[PDB]
């Protein structure tokens, strides 16, 4: 095909010196090409997998991705027959040259985390992505099988295990596998005799004699299965046994959760800058976590009272909010509190809200302050530390290091994918977004943590056609700063997919009448349909009978609300069928946020340009989740739909909330919602990059729904069952806890290999992050 | 006996907050202590081995050193019986409180190389320090024994191995151990029948066909020993065989040696600032090396022409010298050239000489520039790269990385031992000396290199009583910068002692009349005994018939010549017995160097203070080694002595020079000269810290020599033998080449494990050295 293949690069040439993405790629090349396309041979086809290609003079470089998590880079001659296979670094060189004009100084930093991971083998099966604990178990199960030097670690573990000055599992009486083996067998013979429901307290005395401390279970039956479980790990370890035992051992009692940025609170917040899905997730998480812990604790026959602290910034000048108080009990829980610590410098505490992009210079000092405070509140040290987002993961990493605690991170979003080419173009973005800091923190926490939780597969490995969020951090470069050769690997056994949900008593199907909160209908109707225009709501709905196209979200550039508004403004077919109600931004107060401010000015203009008055209602931030639920269900009444038009959406809780209430959802294909929604079944995908087709798809739906109302009900059911299956909080907590067990034990076995990695990070943090963070200007009060 | 320990303890407090070296440690407390000492026993015996004590009001910190390379740190209450065991970091914590007032920032950097060096096991025996290649051999020999995965590296090594386009050893025809085991078997059988003296050209045809390329030997006898060796490695590897095979394989053809600082030349230099032994060491070295390479290349049946390039700086404005010319042929060699590259910045070439303490900002660009130039001179890339000193090892590490070459380093001195407490006190020393740059380069190069060469065992592990030059780098801290927890380990298998010598054509026994160069006797006599005072010589020797107490060196603080002069001045008994002749500094010109200037003023005042005219002759730098040779022998004629009063001397070539000419020698006891000399047998040690005692020691020797002139001869003959035994250039080259063979191969077996350390080291150059090096103010023409 030397004729045909020439013809492609040919088209590529004129395109000039620039970034070739996939769409921006052959979508130009192939579809602008004649019947000569005829490419169903290898060249077009296998290289339909080109993720991006670097356009320069006689060479063009391109990154290819046959399968998720598998990359190969190539350099093909602009005019020539030659293709030479590039190394990751060589490829990244191109990107550097394209911006600065030259590559990075030869001796300028190159991060390679590859050699530091080598402890466990790396699974190559797509199946094991986001499944690592499964993999880790098979590795431990196999390494444990008849190996002395291997088993000791497990015995040392149970012997050292204690909480608040009480011994658990094995006592000091057991010095070796022989006594342990002998004692367990000795215990088993005894217990197999007793009535199943016999309380531990009965056989406690004897158990203390032979070296068994509390926590095996609350009764004979339970203690029995457990002793039988461990005896088995000593004898013939299998992965399922190993997990079950480790997950059962009472461990997690105290938990520390990190969420520094935003206005973190239970009221009067949601919709403010940086306040949103993260805050929601965390409050649901702790409540779900606390129920599971009280249980595991009670089943294991212990009386410890758990504690969960959520750490965040104390903001003294936020008014209307509880953000200025140090300690706050979380709704519907006994043991979960929000702990607030202030940011400070040499000159004293900093009062004013700071954007999440600007917090960096404060975090290290924050970390120390937090350690002191959370130490005051906890009886015992943290049994698990979970970081959230970047600041959260950064701080949680420093703390876990400092307190030697099992650490888990949860990204909630990765900015590198929200802001396209923000890595290569970072320099000009930097005075505003400080991405050099963020990406640094992101890499550091990502490799520092023990395990990683994600809400979907796509967060990790993306899909067959497109690349996942974490995966996009495998190899990248920030020209002038440093180059990341292997930053992360999609196959890492630390990745674990644990899907969240929507609080089921906030969000239920709109069709359950007795449950509908009808006291909210008066206000909901003023909200939507009233003729008043003010800071709460702008414009007016001229027609109250139409279905409502609805969206609710934080207002910023990536949420792309102004985009939706344009698509709708322009589409008369859609405008005639539905009213557009957009909730975003708080216009009650002058916005302090750059993007929100910008985004708001667009909304105003679009109102004027498309003469949107009468079909459009623009609603400020809706902060009560409880009424929020009813809002969703109310839209169902009108037979409307939810739309999520983000340019990228990391997960999309609102998409999960809508589906739970029975509201048919059209959500962006870029990011998490691609995995949540099964197209034509659980909802529909739209592409924010083709807005007019999104608008038309919506129109198609309402049109079909008009002629056949069963169509609406179909998707509503599809959505409801799709949540029932994938997204709920019941499985979450347990999975999370089991993980703490397996990854905690793993710490001790894998201990000494992570020493090298522990220094690389320590040094990366110190020599790279700190100086960058310090560079970021301080806020002035 | 807590009444006693508390005695010495409170004895120590009176000193206050500060450092105490063993000098002071047992000096002040203990025998300067009241006879209540009566110690012996425990707590004296072992803790007389205390190396340093950090004194903070409630506590004292103790670095304890039972055996070379073995360290224990202890905190003990200034008042109390309490003695706790500090881990190294904890002890480093102390020193930091002593200076900054607080310990280093919690998240401030700890350099730890230990976890990276875990690749090979650690020898614990005193006998392997500086013997590392011996240990590596037995390790490789075992790992190699019936290991397919182990043997393959060797086959690959031999297969890929080539030079200048020509294939060596194995050809591509041998892909596996069986084929090779088979080919070698045919080969031995064939050659076995042949006449030993048969040339390789005869069987060259036969060999090529079975896959055997050149380099096994010049004739059949040599080739047969060689093929047998390999057969034996594949069958039953032993260390001695391994060493012999690897040492013998032709490898080193192009050698590159880095020495950027100083005025490096063959004439009109020695004695200038920064120009000294390192220049002598190298010139002597390369000449020996070339001779050996020529030999080896021939024995293996090769026609390759070697090249040895000494990279150093090109100095356009040094007049009276050749420093301004790019390429210079080394005296009395066919293949060794000095290659000069200029320092430069954006503004163009930097003309002026820069002190070795200031070259840091220019080193990276130098590396880039050098790579190009040497690549223009060398035919084929460098086979071995040898760094010298700090700038030299720094640059040589960058090149080695860049071009993929076996690297060796030679320190020639380590500033941290020469400038005591410069690590802990660095910040105040930095504007002047920039030790925050140099200590960084040292740590880096020292861990980056493949193998390290030293001139003595003291350079590495010191003695029973005192710490070594490298060993002092194991644990230290630069408060406010970083903290090296494990920075080096004297048992590290990379250490190899290979002792240098004096050019035997330049320096020989003064008793060989035939050889004495008499045509210099006129100059020498004007130089010593002349009536004239000028830039060339100061004061006057009133009596030409006395013995001369001679010394020669660069003029700087540590060389401590102003002290020798003072000791001499105070001592009337010594002044009567001998004339003091000191060579140092060049007064022909205004002086650019700080210490040299400082040191000259001291010299002047001293001459006036002690009325040194008539006893003392202060001569300027003597830059022609050949006449220097005679001058030594002339001092022998007067029946005098050589004295080396350094506060610290890393090695001391002039000591070896003096001894070799048969001039009895008194050398400092702090440094290499401690090992070079056997007190009373090959010369005498003097303590630069007690000079009044040193002057008296000299007085004694000169007195004894009057009553019994044969005393002199005894030491002279003594020193001579000591040299013919321990220090000469014959074995040096042979050993260097063998180490290059083994470590070269060793790097392929160990390549994978070193990968982490590779990255950690890269990150350190990039985020620590680079920034520091840029902070150094540029030379401005
Ligand atoms: O004015 C608002 C804006 C957002 N939310 C809630 O904030 C979350 C938005 O999270 P999502 O994951 O959808 O987007 P994110 O904020 O995480 O980027 C959802 O629970 C919304 O219901 C809200 O209650 N009121
Ligand atoms: O005025 C001088 C001073 C020194 N040297 C030579 O320089 C070297 C000094 O080497 P050494 O190791 O003793 O001291 P270094 O300068 O290396 O620290 C010796 O060869 C000396 O003979 C010299 O030729 N003329
Ligand atoms: O990136 C999305 C943003 O919204 C949040 O979910 C906060 O509610 C955070 O993850 C981040 O500030
Ligand atoms: O500290 C020793 C100094 O003298 C030299 O030997 C002469 O080049 C170098 O090693 C260094 O400048
Ligand atoms: K226990
Ligand atoms: K070869």
As a whole number of angstroms, the distance between CA A510 and CA A660 comes to: 9
Helix (H/G/I), strand (E/B), else coil: A746: helix
Which residues of chain A have a CB within 8 Å of the CB of B116?
Answer: 756, 759
Query: How many whole angstroms from A161 Cα to the centroid of ligand 3?
Result: 37
A652 in contact with ligand 3, CB cutoff 6 A: no
Residue A49 to residue A464: CA distance in whole angstroms: 9
- Atom 22 of ligand 1 has which residue's CA nearest to it? A654
Nearest to B107 among A364, A482, A757 (CB): A364
**φ and ψ at A486, to 5 degrees?**
-125, 105
Ligand 5 midpoint to CA A120 (Å):
28
Residue B342 C-alpha, separation from nearest chain A C-alpha, in angstroms: 20
Q: How far apart are CA A152 and CA A691, in angstroms?
A: 61
Pocket flag, ligand 3, residue A279 (CB < 6 Å): yes
Residues in A touching B112 (Cβ below 8 Å): 759
The sign of the torsion formed by the CA atoms of A625, A631, A636, A640 equals: negative
Interacting residues of A173 by C-beta distance below 8 A, sequence separation 6+: A179, A210, A211
B482-486: strand order across its sheet: B110-112, B482-486, B476-478
**Which residue minimizes the CA distance to atom 2 of ligand 4?**
B413
CB distance A755–B108 less than 8 Å?
Answer: no
- Measuring from atom 18 of ligand 2, which residue has the nearest CA? B277
A680 in contact with B, Cβ within 8 Å: no
Give residues with Cβ within 8 angstroms of B51, minimum separation 6: B21, B22, B63, B64, B65, B467
CB nearest to B765's CB, from A107, A762, A765 = A107
**Chain A contacts of B763, Cβ < 8 Å?**
109, 111, 760, 763-764, 767
Residue closest by Cα to atom 2 of ligand 3: A413
Do the Cβ atoms of A766 and B402 come within 8 Å? no
Distance B278 CA to ligand 4 centre (A): 5
Q: Find residue B387's DSSP bridge partners.
A: B258, B409
Nearest to B471 by CA among B498, B452, B499: B452
Q: DSSP letters along A316-335, please?
A: TT--SSSTT-SEEEPTT-SS
The bridge status of strand B616-619 relative to strand B537-538 is: antiparallel
Return the ligand number nearest the Cα of A167: 5
A306 closest CA partner among A335, A339, A338, A337: A335
Domains in chain B and their CATH numbers?
A: 1-121 (3.10.450.330), 122-250 (1.20.120.1230), 252-501+729-781 (3.40.50.2000), 502-728 (3.40.50.2000)
Q: Which two tokens stand for residue A611?
A: 């003469």
The count of other CB atoms within 10 Å of the CB of residue B126 is 17
Q: Which among B107, B103, B208 is positioned nearest to B480, based on CA atoms?
A: B103
- Nearest ligand atom owner, CA of A270: 1
Query: Are the Cβ atoms of B763 and A760 closer than 8 angstroms?
Result: yes
- Residue A476 to residue A419: CA distance in whole angstroms: 14
Rounded Cα distance, A646 and A667, in Å:
8
Kindly state if the Cβ of A389 falls inside 6 Å of ligand 3. Answer: yes
Q: Tell me whether B43 touches chain A (CB under 8 Å).
A: no
Solving technique for this entry?
X-ray
Which residues, chain by chain, have CB under 5 Å from ion ligand 6? Answer: B 159, 161, 167, 169-170
> DSSP letter at B148?
H
CB B471 within 8 A of CB B423: no
Residue where the block lists tokens 């990059």: A689
Any chain B CB within 8 A of the CB of A368?
Answer: yes
- Look at residues B723, B516, B727, B537 and name the one whose alpha carbon lies nearest to residue B621: B537
Q: Which residue, B24, B77, B5, is CA-closest to B420?
A: B24
- H or E element: which one contains A620? none
Report in angstroms the alpha-carbon separations of B247 from A452, B219, B735, B744: 50, 18, 8, 10
Distance from CA of B125 to the nearest CA of A (A): 25
> What is the C-alpha separation between B280 and B277, in angstroms, rounded?
5
> Residues before each break in chain A (C–N > 2.5 Å)?
none
Query: Considering only CA atoms, which of A124, A255, A170 is closest in space to residue A739?
Result: A255
What are the residues facing A85 on neighbouring strands?
Answer: A74
Q: Is B767's CB within 8 Å of A111's CB?
A: no
Ligand lying closest to the C-alpha of residue B312: 4
* Residues comprising chain B, all counted: 781
Mutation site for B-interface testing, chosen from A448, A487, A763, A774 by largest number of B Cβ within 10 Å: A763
Residue A582: partners with Cβ closer than 8 Å, 6 or more residues away: A550, A551, A552, A561, A564, A565, A603, A616, A617, A618, A619
Is any atom of ligand 1 closer than 6 Å to the C-beta of A654? Answer: yes
CA of A11 to the centre of ligand 5 (A): 70
- For A107, which of B112, B757, B766 is closest by C-beta distance? B766
Token pair of A68 as six digits? 């998720």
B250 contacts: CB under 8 Å, gap ≥ 6: B163, B168, B215, B296, B297, B300, B302, B304
Q: Which helix (H) or strand (E) holds A180?
A: helix A177-191
Residues listed for chain A:
781
Query: What region does B172 belong to: left with phi over 0, alpha with psi -120 to 50, or beta?
Result: alpha
Can you tell me whether residue B383 is helix, strand or coil? coil
B753 to chain A, closest Cα gap in Å? 8
Contact present, B260 and B363 (Cβ < 8 Å): yes
**Quick one: which ligand is closest to B657's CA?**
2
Using a 6 Å cutoff on CB, does residue B419 contact ligand 4?
A: no
Sequence-ordered strand ranges (E) for A259-362? 307-313, 327-329, 336-341, 343-345, 348-350
CA distances from A763 to A394, B108, B763 (A): 14, 9, 8
Task: Please give the distance, rounded to the nearest whole angstrom, from the Cα atom of residue A594 to the centre of ligand 3.
Answer: 15
Angle at which helices B594-609 and B561-570 pack, to 10 degrees?
10
Q: Distance between CA atoms of B60 and A31, rounded to whole angstroms? A: 79
Q: Which of A258, A249, A323, A333 is nearest to A289 (CA)?
A: A333
Angle (CA) A611 A614 A618, round 5°? 85
The atom of ligand 2 lying closest to the CA of B502 is 20
CA B327, CA A385: separation in Å to the nearest integer?
A: 63
Nearest ligand for residue A412 CA: 3
Q: Which of A112, A402, A763 sits opposite B109 (nearest CB)?
A: A763
Nearest CA in chain B to A762: B109
Those of residues 101-120 in B touching chain A at CB distance below 8 A are 106-112, 115-116
Q: Is A274 in the pocket of ligand 3 (CB under 6 A)?
A: yes
Distance CA B561, CA B574 (A): 16
DSSP category for residue A214: B
A762 closest CB neighbour out of B110, B752, B758: B110
- In angstroms, the first-to-last Cα distance of chain A is 67
Q: Which atom of ligand 4 is nearest to the CA of B356?
A: 12
B455 lines ligand 2 (CB under 6 A): no
Q: What is the DSSP string of B530-588?
A: -S--SSSEES-BS-TTS-EEEEE---STTTTHHHHHHHHHH-HHHHHH-EEEEE---TT
Tokens found for residue A589:
């107060």
Q: What does the angle CA B12 – CA B14 – CA B20 come to, to the nearest 5 degrees? A: 45
CA distances from A529 to A118, A518, A522, B553 (A): 61, 17, 10, 97
d(CA A396, CA A405): 10
């Amino acid at each position: 095909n030397e004729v045909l293949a020439l013809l492609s690069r040919v088209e590529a040439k004129g395109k000039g010196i620039l970034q070739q993405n996939q769409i921006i790629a052959e979508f130009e090349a192939l579809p602008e090409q004649t019947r000569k396309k005829l490419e169903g041979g290898p060249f077009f086809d296998l290289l339909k997998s080109t993720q991006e290609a670097i356009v320069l003079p006689p060479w063009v470089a391109l990154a290819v991705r046959p399968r998720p998590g598998v990359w190969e880079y190539l350099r093909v001659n602009l005019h020539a027959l030659v293709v030479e296979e590039l190394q990751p670094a060589e490829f990244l060189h191109f990107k550097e040259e394209l911006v600065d004009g030259v590559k990075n100084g030869n001796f300028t930093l190159e991060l390679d985390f590859e050699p530091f991971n080598a402890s466990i083998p790396r699974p190559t099966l797509h199946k094991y992505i986001g499944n690592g604990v499964d993999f880790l178990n098979r590795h431990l199960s196999a390494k444990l099988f008849h190996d002395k030097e291997s088993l000791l670690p497990l015995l040392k573990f149970l012997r050292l295990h204690s909480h608040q000055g009480k011994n658990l599992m094995l006592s000091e009486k057991i010095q070796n596998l022989n006594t342990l083996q002998h004692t367990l067998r000795k215990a088993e013979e005894y217990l197999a005799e007793l009535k199943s429901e016999t309380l531990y307290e009965e056989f406690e005395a004897k158990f203390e004699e032979i070296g068994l401390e509390r926590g095996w279970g609350d009764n004979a039956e339970r203690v029995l299965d457990m002793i039988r479980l461990l005896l088995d790990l000593l004898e013939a370890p299998d992965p399922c046994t190993l997990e079950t035992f480790l997950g059962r051992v009472p461990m997690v009692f105290n938990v520390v959760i990190l969420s520094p940025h935003g206005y973190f609170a239970q009221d009067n917040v949601l919709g403010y800058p940086d306040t949103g899905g993260q805050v929601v997730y965390i409050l649901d998480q702790v409540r779900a976590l606390e129920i599971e812990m009280l249980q595991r604790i009670k089943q294991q026959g212990l009386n410890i009272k758990p504690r969960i602290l959520i750490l965040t910034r104390l903001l003294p000048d936020a008014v209307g909010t509880t953000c200025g108080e140090r300690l706050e009990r979380v709704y519907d829980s006994e043991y979960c509190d929000i702990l607030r610590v202030p940011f400070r410098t040499e000159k004293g505490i900093v009062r004013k809200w700071i954007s999440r992009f600007e917090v960096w210079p404060y975090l290290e000092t924050y970390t120390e302050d937090a350690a002191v405070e959370l130490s005051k509140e906890l009886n015992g040290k943290p049994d698990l530390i979970i970081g959230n987002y970047s600041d959260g993961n950064l701080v949680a990493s420093l703390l876990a290091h400092k307190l030697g605690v099992t650490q888990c991170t949860i990204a909630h979003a990765l900015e590198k994918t929200k802001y396209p080419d923000s890595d290569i173009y970072w320099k000009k973005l930097d005075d505003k977004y400080h991405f050099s800091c963020q990406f640094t923190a992101d890499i550091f926490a990502m490799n520092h943590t023990d395990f990683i939780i994600t809400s979907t597969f796509q967060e990790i490995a993306g899909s067959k056609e497109t690349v996942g969020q974490y995966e996009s951090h495998t190899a990248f470069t920030l020209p002038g700063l440093y180059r990341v050769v292997h930053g992360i690997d999609v196959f890492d056994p630390k990745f674990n997919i644990v899907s969240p949900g929507a609080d089921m008593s906030i969000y239920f199907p709109y069709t359950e009448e007795k449950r509908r909160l009808t006291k909210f209908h008066s206000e909901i109707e003023e909200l939507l349909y009233s003729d008043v225009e003010n800071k709460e709501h702008l414009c007016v709905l001229k027609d109250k009978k139409k279905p409502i196209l609805f969206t609710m979200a934080r207002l910023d550039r990536v949420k792309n609300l102004s985009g939706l508004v344009e698509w709708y403004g322009k589409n008369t077919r859609l405008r005639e069928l539905a009213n557009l109600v957009v909730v975003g931004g708080d216009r009650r107060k002058e916005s302090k946020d750059n993007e929100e401010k910008a985004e708001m000015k667009k909304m105003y203009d679009l109102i004027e340009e498309y003469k949107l008055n009468g079909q459009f209602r623009w609603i400020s931030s809706q902060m009560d989740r409880v009424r929020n639920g009813e809002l969703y269900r109310y839209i169902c009444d009108t037979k409307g739909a939810f739309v999520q038009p983000a340019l990228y959406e990391a997960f999309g809780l609102t998409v999960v909330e809508a589906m739970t209430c029975g509201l048919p959802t059209f959500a962006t294909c870029k990011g998490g919602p691609a995995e949540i929604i099964v197209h034509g079944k659980s909802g529909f995908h739209i592409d924010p990059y083709h807005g007019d087709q999104a608008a038309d798809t919506l129109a198609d739906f309402f049109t079909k729904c008009k002629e056949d109302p069963s169509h609406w009900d179909e998707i509503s059911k599809g959505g409801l069952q799709r949540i029932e299956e994938k997204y709920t909080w019941q499985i979450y907590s347990q999975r999370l806890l089991t993980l703490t067990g397996v990854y905690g034990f793993w710490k001790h076995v894998s201990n000494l290999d992570r020493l090298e990695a522990r220094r690389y990070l320590e040094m990366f943090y110190a020599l790279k992050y700190r100086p960058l963070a310090q560079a970021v200007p301080l806020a002035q009060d």
